[PDB]
Structure 1
Amino acid sequence: TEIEHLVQSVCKSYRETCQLRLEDLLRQRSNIFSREEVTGYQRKSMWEMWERCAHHLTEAIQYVVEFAKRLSGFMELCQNDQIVLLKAGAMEVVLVRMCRAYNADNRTVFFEGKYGGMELFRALGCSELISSIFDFSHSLSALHFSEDEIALYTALVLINAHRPGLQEKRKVEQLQYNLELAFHHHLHKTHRQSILAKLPPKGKLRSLCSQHVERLQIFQHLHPIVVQAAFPPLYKELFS
């Protein structure tokens, strides 16, 4: 069916843009920052940690932009709608992708080549927001997302006809309905429909991610970093 091909193309787009390989991430779980290395990060200036973390986060976004660009029918949307969907959803996808890099056993994340806890980031002074991000990954870790499940769920995070400001809402609805069918179909074929009831509630991802982006906007205002835009019109609604 056109649906099994849509499943295959979404998984392919994901596989090509997932940035880090699951085998690598799982294999390096034992490669953990030492007390001294942690202290090294904690003593850095707020502004150097910000530069590092901002560069890594914009690179994560760019992989999500390529994921979207390779999604069947994503380019056939009007550029306004491309921007609206990426502007509402790209960071939500990055926060979802974090669960693959996150180890629930010791509440660590993969960062510059090893695993560390949220205290790595103490110099940024965002204790409560970073803790929220870690908690969200802790929740998503319990689902043991397969790669294809992550691919199909993140596709649906982006392709959402409820985002305000769409010019061709019906064209987005058609992608969304197809991806919904692809996702349900896949879950049925793998006996994993049970994850549907365990998915994060939409307002949760939305309000966590809008706080995150709001804090990044504030740091970017106090201490601008500069990046070579992959999607210039989209860069402009965030680097404006």
Structure 2
Amino acid sequence: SPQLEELITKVSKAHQETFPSLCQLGKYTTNSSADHRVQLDLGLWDKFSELATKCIIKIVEFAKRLPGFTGLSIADQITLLKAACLDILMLRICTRYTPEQDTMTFSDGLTLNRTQMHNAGFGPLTDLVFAFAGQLLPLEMDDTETGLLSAICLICGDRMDLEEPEKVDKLQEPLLEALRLYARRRRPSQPYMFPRMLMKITDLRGISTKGAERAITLKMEIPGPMPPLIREMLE
């Protein structure tokens, strides 16, 4: 119980210090390809891919702040990050959804409308990602819950090629305990919030599967290779 409370605060702070909240960021816009969908706008892809690389690095930084993660083998650390990074990217961008304006906001404040998200690279995946974001809103998750859910997504023992899956399982246990404790304490009249949050992990895995399929077609549309940390994530 004191150790669990410290875990909650450590994970929450790790998330916040690697992921500014929508409220914190000074939004700015772009007028590129803003009113009609096109196969790909290469100026938007260049900016989007740069922001994706930066957030991958931030997710690695987050991961290394999770209690016990750096006690896993370096191979297992890398396997877990490769398996979960796109899931966590998807959760992160969808927490930055502003429904009144139909926009998502990146960590430098760049705020793209739905058509621009399409044109930056999401392409035919755009509306499914926005629908996931829309169905995240009624859970009204806070930053602590987003951070814990992210940690649960990452630290999971089912990933292929783990050396020490039991060790990974044991690290996940307190994160699950922490999320349930926190969520019920914050909103005791809404006891389905914890199971709803865990079911979002399945949704995220589905959308990340679709994102990996989109990466294959996108590669045929861009003038060079994808950035190297994106390629690490996709392998």
Aligned to 2:194: 196
Aligned to 2:8: 7
Q: Name the CA distance, whole Å, in 1 between partners of 2:65 and 2:74.
A: 15
Distance 1:169 1:38, change over 3 A: same
Distance 1:2 1:134, change over 3 A: same
Q: Name the CA distance, whole Å, in 1 between partners of 2:234 and 2:82.
A: 12
- Worse-matched range after superposition: 43-52 or 162-171: 43-52
Distance 1:93 1:125, change over 3 A: closer
Structure 1 residue 220: Cα displacement? 4.2
Mapped contact 2:40–2:123 kept (Cα < 8 A) = no
2:74 to 66, 75, 79: 79
The SS at the match of 2:24 is helix
- Structure-2-length-normalised TM-score: 0.83
Aligned to 1:100: 95
1:80-229 equivalences under 5 Å are 80-110=75-105, 113-123=109-119, 126-191=122-187, 193-199=191-197, 200-220=199-219, 222=222, 223-227=224-228
Deviation per residue, 1:212-237 (Å, 9 max, x gap): 1332244346521445x5xxxxx774
Mapped contact 1:102–1:110 kept (Cα < 8 A) = yes
Q: Name the CA distance, whole Å, in 1 between partners of 2:39 and 2:214.
A: 19
Structure 1 residue 117: Cα displacement? 2.2
Distance 1:236 1:92, change over 3 A: closer
Identity over aligned pairs, percent: 26
Mapped contact 1:41–1:121 kept (Cα < 8 A) = no
Deviation per residue, 1:49-94 (Å, 9 max, x gap): 3222111112122111110011110000011211121111111111
Runs of 4+ in 1 over 6 A off after TM superposition: none
Q: Name the CA distance, whole Å, in 1 between partners of 2:94 and 2:207.
A: 15
Q: Name the CA distance, whole Å, in 2 between partners of 1:188 and 1:3.
A: 14
1:47-66 equivalences under 5 Å are 47-66=42-61
1:1-40 equivalences under 5 Å are 1-18=2-19, 20-25=20-25, 28=27, 37-39=31-33
The SS at the match of 1:22 is coil
Q: Name structure 2 gaps, 5 residues minimum.
A: none
The SS at the match of 1:24 is coil
Distance 1:41 1:47, change over 3 A: farther
- Structure-1-length-normalised TM-score: 0.81
Deviation per residue, 1:129-148 (Å, 9 max, x gap): 01111111111122121111
Report the count of equivalent residues: 227
Q: Name the CA distance, whole Å, in 2 between partners of 1:216 and 1:7.
A: 34
Q: Name the CA distance, whole Å, in 1 between partners of 2:86 and 2:208.
A: 7
Mapped contact 1:81–1:167 kept (Cα < 8 A) = yes
One-letter identity of the residue aligned with 1:16 = E
One-letter identity of the residue aligned with 2:16 = R
The SS at the match of 1:136 is helix
Provide the aligned C-alpha RMSD in A. Answer: 2.8
The SS at the match of 1:109 is strand
Structure 1 residue 126: Cα displacement? 4.7
Q: Name the CA distance, whole Å, in 1 between partners of 2:146 and 2:136.
A: 10
Q: Name the CA distance, whole Å, in 2 between partners of 1:3 and 1:84.
A: 26
